[PDB]
């Protein structure tokens, strides 16, 4: 034939760290500690694991097995399972385009924060700048100062009025135009991800070596730093204080489920693509288990990394760590934590390694994110594509860049929240539900266990079978239903989102999976004979 076989991994450890690097990201750092603190404290550890063992791990492993078995992309694998659901492979693609529209921009901020941290005196320490207002009040200033409703901090001023420049927009209505600085930053980022993907899985298994190992080192440094800070015990106390009355609330369970879903990131085809390039007789059980156990542990220690510093910050101020940790977003890192860094010796150092940590937290996760889609398209359109990989990868990166220009505006953060919570999320959960239903109830869970019996040499236990059959689809179903029944009220930087925000978010969300029902209709209108015979050729693999 013209082309026979696909490529593989250079080393077990390379992809073993690649999947982990993708699982570990920003959200592991700041989302889990916050949601863990406000939902029972240490007592949040109990439902967090239950939603993992019964929900997260089975989806993770089930997703990781199909890829290493069929060795196909996110699109071509459905042709070999359920052709009508092939639209899924396309849907995710569109989804990715939305995600990459904001997920990179965040890193851009860090980058802009990193290139501004080479000064002996950090910009967000003093108030004597070109962006600060008359409200700017800092420390190493007059004592007795008292905070006012309109007063702001130099860190908050630096994030708000300089890098983000969100004061130049009135909301989603008026947000233009684009900031060229963050454009250059996001260009540098879209350049650093290009040379880590364009050669294929060869480089994406080598670049990951740094991006996945650096954050643990940096987290260690920040850990031994924050542990030495006075009054850091308050943050740990607030972090681990058991509130068993929270478990009675049906909300924290859904929060844990969603949280453990998104941290794992199953159902997206990334793990499918990563598993595709691997040994056929290679173990899937141990791989999935270990990686996940890390993604979580890493979240767990990240909690300390944050709360020691926030505890110190509450000690320097006056207590109630919730007050210093009211805002649940990037501001917790770009303002609070940064302001805490500025008031420490060797501040330049602890700033550089921190922002560098953030960037490396993001890239690896962004490497795979594109990697899965690229793999899918190349596997769906083989030999019409792959003529060169750099061409297609470039064609994707540039498109994502133009797709991120909406986010690079002055009112970009608003768009970040809107897209991340009202658009991409429920759609990823939705398509994940569709996959979970499709593999278990159409392809057959028994045949799946037989395939695992072929790869691993033994059929998977009843504990996992009973999870794939009933527990996991209901696990996703619960989250989806919980969101759709009551979407959360969005708020960012003293600005409440318009009532029509949900309409826009749902509009962007639905436009992503317009392809699956119309593709079902496509094959249903294309395949001759009875509709039962067409659905028979649609149910039976090809």
């Amino acid at each position, epitope marked *: 034939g013209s082309q026979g076989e696909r490529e593989t991994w250079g080393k077990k450890v390379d992809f073993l760290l690649s999947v982990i690097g993708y699982a570990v990201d920003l959200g592991n750092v700041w989302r889990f500690p916050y949601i863990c603190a406000q939902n029972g404290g240490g007592a949040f550890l109990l439902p967090y694991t239950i939603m993992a063992i019964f929900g997260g791990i089975p989806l993770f492993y089930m997703e990781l097995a199909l890829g290493q078995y069929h060795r196909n992309g996110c699109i071509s694998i459905w042709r070999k399972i359920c052709p009508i659901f092939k639209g899924i492979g396309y849907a995710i693609c569109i989804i990715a385009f939305y995600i990459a529209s904001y997920y990179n921009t965040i890193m851009a901020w860090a980058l802009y924060y990193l290139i501004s941290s080479f000064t002996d005196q950090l910009p967000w320490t003093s108030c004597k700048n070109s962006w600060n207002t008359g409200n700017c009040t800092n420390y190493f200033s007059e004592d007795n100062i008292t*905070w006012t409703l309109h007063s702001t901090s130099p860190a908050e001023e630096f994030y708000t009025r300089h890098v983000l420049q969100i004061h130049r927009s009135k909301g989603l209505q008026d947000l233009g135009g684009i900031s060229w600085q963050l454009a250059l930053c996001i260009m540098l980022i879209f350049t650093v991800i290009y040379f880590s993907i364009w050669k294929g899985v060869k480089t994406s298994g080598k670049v990951v070596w740094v991006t996945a190992t650096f954050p643990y080192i940096a987290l260690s440094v920040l850990l031994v730093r924050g542990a030495t800070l006075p009054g850091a015990w308050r943050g740990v106390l607030f972090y681990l204080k058991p509130n068993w009355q929270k478990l009675l609330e049906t909300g924290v369970w859904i929060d844990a489920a969603a949280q453990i879903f998104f941290s794992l990131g199953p159902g997206f085809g990334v793990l499918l693509a990563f598993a595709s390039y691997n040994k056929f007789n290679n173990n899937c059980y141990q791989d999935a288990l270990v990686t996940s156990v890390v993604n979580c542990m890493t979240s767990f220690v990240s909690g300390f990394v944050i709360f020691t510093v926030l505890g110190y910050m509450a000690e320097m101020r*006056n*207590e109630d760590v919730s007050e210093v940790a009211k805002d649940a977003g990037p501001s917790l890192l770009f303002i609070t934590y940064a302001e805490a860094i500025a008031n420490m010796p060797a501040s330049t150092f602890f700033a550089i390694i921190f922002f560098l940590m953030l960037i490396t937290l993001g890239l690896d996760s962004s490497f795979a994110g594109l990697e899965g889609v690229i793999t899918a398209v190349l596997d769906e359109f083989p030999h019409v594509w792959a003529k060169r990989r750099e061409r297609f990868v470039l064609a994707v990166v540039i498109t994502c860049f133009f797709g991120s220009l909406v986010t690079l505006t002055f009112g970009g953060a608003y768009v970040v929240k809107l897209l991340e919570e009202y658009a991409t999320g429920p759609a990823v959960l939705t398509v994940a539900l569709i996959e979970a239903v499709a593999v278990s109830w159409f392809y057959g869970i028994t045949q799946f266990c037989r395939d695992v019996k072929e790869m691993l040499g033994f059929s998977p236990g009843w504990f996992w079978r009973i999870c794939w059959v009933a527990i996991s689809p209901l696990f996703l179903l619960f989250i989806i239903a919980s969101f759709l029944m009551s979407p959360p009220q969005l708020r960012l930087f003293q600005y409440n989102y318009p009532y029509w925000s949900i309409i826009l978010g749902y509009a962007i969300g639905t436009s992503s999976f317009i392809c699956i029902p119309t593709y079902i209709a496509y094959r249903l209108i294309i395949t001759p004979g009875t509709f039962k015979e067409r659905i028979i050729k649609s149910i039976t693999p090809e």
Partner: antibody
Amino acid sequence: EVQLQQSGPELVKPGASVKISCKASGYTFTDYYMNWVKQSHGKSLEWIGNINPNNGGTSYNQKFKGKATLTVDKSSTTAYMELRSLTSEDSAVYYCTRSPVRPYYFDYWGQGTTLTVSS
Amino acid sequence: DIVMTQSHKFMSTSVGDRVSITCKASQDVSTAVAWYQQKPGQSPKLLIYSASYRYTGVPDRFTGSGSGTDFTFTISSVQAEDLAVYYCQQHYSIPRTFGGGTKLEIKR
């Protein structure tokens, strides 16, 4: 001359509602949180809740959730507190006091408002 | 929530004597304690804020000390017009709670 002038005494039957005003002067009204403290006869002070005059950003106490409702008017720089479902326990002296965001102390108080809930 | 406990509901002192009121909190507070003075028939008046710091328009005879859970409000020279009920209040956690109150009676 920071002065906080409240309304006069109120005698109301149980089950009814009552609104208390709070005219502020001598400072930038949009700069400070406006609070309401309940003091029973012979008892201690009891913080009901605050309100942000800029947008009406209320923050009530769990013990007063559904008991008190705080409003504000920037046009006349005046705060208001409404109490529904009045009982004998509500018969107490209420104050409205100014407070910054940090440190959260009550620098200036009103003269107080004697509430009597009886038929 | 937080429980600010004043064990001594009443304390006796004389004109010119040194009097000190104690305030016990539930958890560690660091330095977030305010002291208010309420004369019979008047509204409370802020005297001390943040453990030791005095507020503007407060005499030098009123001091404040403490760091943690136990706090102390000290008066050096007691005057006849110093007759009032004194309250301590935490200002860190929501909601803001007050102490029981220590009615300072003057002995003569």
